[PDB]
Amino acid sequence: MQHASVIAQFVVEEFLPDVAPADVDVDLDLVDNGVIDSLGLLKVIAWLEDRFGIAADDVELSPEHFRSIRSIDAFVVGATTPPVEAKLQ
């Protein structure tokens, strides 16, 4: 897990940026925020894939992928771990 704090900040900042993301239990299943799994996922995959040019086929989309931030961290780290100071819309 590299820059794991950025991953929580990346997802948490999108939902609650007025709250310190490092002060949020990053152990919460993003499923509650599943709102991003469909509407945000379409925008994130289209924008995120374009930014790194990663084909969606490389990874399958499913609710289990958002079950926990740690699970996603492994898939992202296994392919690419891009650290960012803040989430870009």
Ligand X SMILES: *P(=O)(O)OCC(C)(C)[C@H](O)C(=O)NCCC(=O)NCCS
Summarize as ranges the residues that interact with ligand X (CB under 6 A).
34, 37-38, 41-42, 61-63
Name the packing angle between helices 69-79 and 4-15 (round to 10°). Answer: 120
Give the count of alpha carbons within 13 A of 18, CB side only.
0
Residue nearest to ligand X (CB): 38
- Report d(CA 45, CA 35) in Å as an integer: 14
Shortest distance, CB of residue 63 to ligand X, whole angstroms? 4
Shortest distance, CB of residue 42 to ligand X, whole angstroms? 4
Q: Which CB sits closer to ligand X, 3 or 15?
A: 15
Q: Which CB sits closer to ligand X, 33 or 81?
A: 33
